[PDB]
Write an enzyme that holds these catalytic residues in place. Structure first.
Site, PDB file in Angstrom:
ATOM      1  N   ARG A  44      94.383  84.038  90.689  1.00 18.56           N
ATOM      2  CA  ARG A  44      94.560  85.376  90.155  1.00 18.56           C
ATOM      3  C   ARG A  44      94.592  85.279  88.640  1.00 18.56           C
ATOM      4  O   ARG A  44      94.833  84.214  88.074  1.00 18.56           O
ATOM      5  CB  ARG A  44      95.921  85.942  90.539  1.00 18.56           C
ATOM      6  CG  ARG A  44      96.155  86.173  91.968  1.00 18.56           C
ATOM      7  CD  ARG A  44      97.617  86.499  92.124  1.00 18.56           C
ATOM      8  NE  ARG A  44      98.450  85.314  92.320  1.00 18.56           N
ATOM      9  CZ  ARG A  44      99.751  85.368  92.570  1.00 18.56           C
ATOM     10  NH1 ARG A  44     100.359  86.543  92.622  1.00 18.56           N
ATOM     11  NH2 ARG A  44     100.439  84.253  92.785  1.00 18.56           N
ATOM     12  N   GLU A 109      93.633  83.888  75.869  1.00 17.36           N
ATOM     13  CA  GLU A 109      93.681  85.119  75.095  1.00 17.36           C
ATOM     14  C   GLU A 109      93.331  86.290  76.009  1.00 17.36           C
ATOM     15  O   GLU A 109      92.463  86.182  76.885  1.00 17.36           O
ATOM     16  CB  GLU A 109      92.667  85.056  73.956  1.00 17.36           C
ATOM     17  N   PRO A 112      91.254  93.031  75.795  1.00 17.64           N
ATOM     18  CA  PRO A 112      91.642  94.295  76.441  1.00 17.64           C
ATOM     19  C   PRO A 112      90.505  95.253  76.743  1.00 17.64           C
ATOM     20  O   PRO A 112      90.732  96.252  77.431  1.00 17.64           O
ATOM     21  CB  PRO A 112      92.606  94.906  75.428  1.00 17.64           C
ATOM     22  CG  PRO A 112      92.142  94.333  74.099  1.00 17.64           C
ATOM     23  CD  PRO A 112      91.772  92.931  74.421  1.00 17.64           C
ATOM     24  N   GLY A 113      89.301  95.000  76.265  1.00 17.29           N
ATOM     25  CA  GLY A 113      88.221  95.941  76.495  1.00 17.29           C
ATOM     26  C   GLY A 113      87.622  95.904  77.877  1.00 17.29           C
ATOM     27  O   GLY A 113      86.823  96.780  78.211  1.00 17.29           O
ATOM     28  N   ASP A 154      78.099  80.185  85.622  1.00 14.12           N
ATOM     29  CA  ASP A 154      78.680  81.386  86.209  1.00 14.12           C
ATOM     30  C   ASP A 154      78.375  82.634  85.396  1.00 14.12           C
ATOM     31  O   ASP A 154      79.194  83.550  85.330  1.00 14.12           O
ATOM     32  CB  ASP A 154      80.186  81.231  86.442  1.00 14.12           C
ATOM     33  CG  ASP A 154      80.684  82.067  87.619  1.00 14.12           C
ATOM     34  OD1 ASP A 154      79.853  82.488  88.456  1.00 14.12           O
ATOM     35  OD2 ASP A 154      81.897  82.325  87.703  1.00 14.12           O
ATOM     36  N   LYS A 156      77.340  86.181  84.654  1.00 14.52           N
ATOM     37  CA  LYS A 156      77.262  87.440  85.381  1.00 14.52           C
ATOM     38  C   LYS A 156      78.048  88.465  84.568  1.00 14.52           C
ATOM     39  O   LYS A 156      78.878  88.084  83.745  1.00 14.52           O
ATOM     40  CB  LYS A 156      77.837  87.310  86.802  1.00 14.52           C
ATOM     41  CG  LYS A 156      79.266  86.864  86.880  1.00 14.52           C
ATOM     42  CD  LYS A 156      79.690  86.739  88.330  1.00 14.52           C
ATOM     43  CE  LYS A 156      81.127  86.310  88.447  1.00 14.52           C
ATOM     44  NZ  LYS A 156      81.506  86.195  89.876  1.00 14.52           N
ATOM     45  N   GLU A 158      80.497  90.398  85.101  1.00 13.92           N
ATOM     46  CA  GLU A 158      81.946  90.408  85.277  1.00 13.92           C
ATOM     47  C   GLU A 158      82.631  89.370  84.407  1.00 13.92           C
ATOM     48  O   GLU A 158      83.825  89.505  84.132  1.00 13.92           O
ATOM     49  CB  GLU A 158      82.306  90.144  86.749  1.00 13.92           C
ATOM     50  CG  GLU A 158      81.895  91.242  87.730  1.00 13.92           C
ATOM     51  CD  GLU A 158      80.458  91.142  88.267  1.00 13.92           C
ATOM     52  OE1 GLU A 158      79.613  90.368  87.736  1.00 13.92           O
ATOM     53  OE2 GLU A 158      80.183  91.869  89.259  1.00 13.92           O
ATOM     54  N   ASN A 159      81.919  88.334  83.980  1.00 10.43           N
ATOM     55  CA  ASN A 159      82.533  87.263  83.216  1.00 10.43           C
ATOM     56  C   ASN A 159      82.400  87.440  81.714  1.00 10.43           C
ATOM     57  O   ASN A 159      82.797  86.548  80.963  1.00 10.43           O
ATOM     58  CB  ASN A 159      81.972  85.904  83.638  1.00 10.43           C
ATOM     59  CG  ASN A 159      82.543  85.438  84.949  1.00 10.43           C
ATOM     60  OD1 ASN A 159      83.529  86.000  85.449  1.00 10.43           O
ATOM     61  ND2 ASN A 159      81.966  84.382  85.493  1.00 10.43           N
ATOM     62  N   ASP A 172      86.009  82.506  82.462  1.00 16.34           N
ATOM     63  CA  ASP A 172      85.834  81.851  83.757  1.00 16.34           C
ATOM     64  C   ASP A 172      84.921  80.643  83.647  1.00 16.34           C
ATOM     65  O   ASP A 172      83.701  80.743  83.795  1.00 16.34           O
ATOM     66  CB  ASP A 172      85.362  82.794  84.862  1.00 16.34           C
ATOM     67  CG  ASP A 172      85.582  82.206  86.232  1.00 16.34           C
ATOM     68  OD1 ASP A 172      85.871  80.992  86.303  1.00 16.34           O
ATOM     69  OD2 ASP A 172      85.495  82.944  87.232  1.00 16.34           O
ATOM     70  N   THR A 189      76.830  82.966  91.593  1.00 15.58           N
ATOM     71  CA  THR A 189      76.837  84.166  92.423  1.00 15.58           C
ATOM     72  C   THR A 189      75.411  84.496  92.840  1.00 15.58           C
ATOM     73  O   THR A 189      74.474  84.261  92.059  1.00 15.58           O
ATOM     74  CB  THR A 189      77.483  85.395  91.731  1.00 15.58           C
ATOM     75  OG1 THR A 189      77.818  86.388  92.717  1.00 15.58           O
ATOM     76  CG2 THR A 189      76.562  86.021  90.722  1.00 15.58           C
TER      77      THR A 189
HETATM   78  N1  LIG Z   1      91.108  86.612  79.221  1.00 14.56           N
HETATM   79  C1  LIG Z   1      91.209  87.817  79.770  1.00 14.56           C
HETATM   80  O1  LIG Z   1      91.563  88.806  79.153  1.00 14.56           O
HETATM   81  C2  LIG Z   1      90.854  87.954  81.208  1.00 14.56           C
HETATM   82  C3  LIG Z   1      91.068  89.164  81.864  1.00 14.56           C
HETATM   83  C4  LIG Z   1      90.734  89.307  83.199  1.00 14.56           C
HETATM   84  C5  LIG Z   1      90.191  88.240  83.913  1.00 14.56           C
HETATM   85  C6  LIG Z   1      89.891  88.393  85.362  1.00 14.56           C
HETATM   86  O2  LIG Z   1      90.103  89.454  85.944  1.00 14.56           O
HETATM   87  O3  LIG Z   1      89.398  87.338  85.942  1.00 14.56           O
HETATM   88  C7  LIG Z   1      89.971  87.034  83.252  1.00 14.56           C
HETATM   89  C8  LIG Z   1      90.301  86.893  81.916  1.00 14.56           C
END
Ligand SMILES: NC(=O)c1ccc(C(=O)O)cc1
Length: 338
Positions: A44, A109, A112-113, A154, A156, A158-159, A172, A189
């Site tokens: 998580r 780190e 926040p965006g 990885d 994509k 989302e990363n 990630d 993926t």
């Molecule tokens: N470094 C981040 O702010 C960060 C935020 C969310 C996620 C996730 O949902 O896997 C990973 C990294």
């Protein structure tokens, strides 16, 4: 020579940290838990606040027993050893790491965006200039990583997180690996897998350049090039050597994408004798000032809306589960080096 000397210094600095990794640089009770930002089969990510400094961080928590069961031991050791050793403007920074009886922790780190993916899906598709701004950051990041003998594996939407200046931070490193020749693990993926991964070959950094082609296509079209309802159907399209481009794509974009989405890895841009320069010098990138991007002097296409470093509004909602720490040490041997 300026680029050569930059990359030589980058490799020197990486190797010093790679050979002597940091360990055990914080502990769990230094932090307050705020909100779960993401969740998966063995880990998580949680927004946390450091109790003494007040700084916010994204804490990735991996359950050791689940990492073992899902055969991710080496991958999680890769992730932490690489993250503690790298340094680049478009990589999320690892700030602390530690472990306890039950879990592994990487304190990153907080960006926040939110995920590029969210913004892409909100707006539908990015204009070519907007896609190009993000793509240039990935090109430079892969130039950096590949020069260190690292493959990312990885890529994509989302990363890619969007920071307070509108720039990308890649997160990630769960599949990242130091590879000097070839490697063989099936990972990634589905929509982003290069043909040579699907076909179980020994593959190399060219898979990252294929994935960049997929990313650029998805940013500019709003959907990925090999889309289908089930993985097997996606894989058949990937290995076919055929891609259809929207009529709104420029000719330059189509030409670049044909060279990144080249099934024959020996003919794929990024993997030829001129390396990354075949990409950087392509006409689709003619308006890109590579140095200005690196220095974060280009005004971004948009600044994400958020209220401050603790705002979670650009991330979504997940069931809040315990961070339980067993009274007995689990899997100590497997994770000794973490
Ligand atoms: N470094 C981040 O702010 C960060 C935020 C969310 C996620 C996730 O949902 O896997 C990973 C990294």
């Amino acid at each position: 020579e300026s680029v050569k000397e930059f990359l030589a210094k980058a490799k020197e600095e990486f190797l010093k940290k790679w050979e002597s990794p940091s360990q055990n640089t914080a502990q769990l009770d230094h932090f307050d838990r705020i909100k779960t930002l993401g969740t998966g089969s063995f880990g998580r990510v949680m927004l946390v606040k450091h109790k003494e400094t007040g700084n916010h961080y994204a804490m990735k928590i991996l359950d050791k027993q689940k990492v073992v069961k899902l055969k991710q031991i080496e991958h999680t050791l890769n992730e932490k050893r690489i993250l503690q050793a790298v340094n680049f403007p478009f990589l999320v920074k690892l700030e602390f790491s530690f472990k306890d009886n039950s879990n592994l922790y990487m304190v990153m780190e907080y960006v926040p965006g939110g995920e590029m993916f969210s913004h892409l899906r909100r707006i539908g598709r990015f204009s070519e200039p907007h896609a190009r701004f993000y793509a240039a950051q990935i090109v430079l990041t892969f130039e950096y990583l590949h020069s260190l003998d690292l493959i990312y594996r990885d890529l994509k939407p989302e990363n890619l997180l969007i920071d307070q200046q509108g720039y990308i931070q890649v997160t990630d490193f769960g599949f990242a690996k130091r590879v000097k020749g070839r490697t063989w693990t099936l990972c990634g993926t589905p929509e982003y897998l290069a043909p040579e991964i699907i076909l179980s070959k020994g593959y190399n950094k060219a898979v990252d350049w294929w994935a960049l082609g997929v990313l650029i296509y998805e940013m500019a079209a709003g959907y990925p090039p090999f889309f289908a309802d089930q993985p097997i159907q996606i894989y058949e399209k990937i290995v076919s050597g055929k891609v259809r481009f929207p009529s709104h794509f420029s000719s330059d974009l189509k030409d670049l994408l044909r060279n990144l989405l080249q099934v024959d890895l020996t003919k794929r841009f990024g993997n030829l004798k001129n390396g990354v320069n075949d990409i950087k010098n392509h006409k689709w990138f003619a308006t890109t000032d590579w140095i200005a991007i690196y220095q974060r002097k280009v005004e971004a296409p948009f600044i994400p809306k958020f209220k401050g470093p603790g705002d979670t509004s650009n991330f979504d909602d997940y069931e809040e589960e315990e961070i339980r720490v067993s009274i007995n040490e689990k899997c100590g041997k497997e994770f000794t080096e973490f």
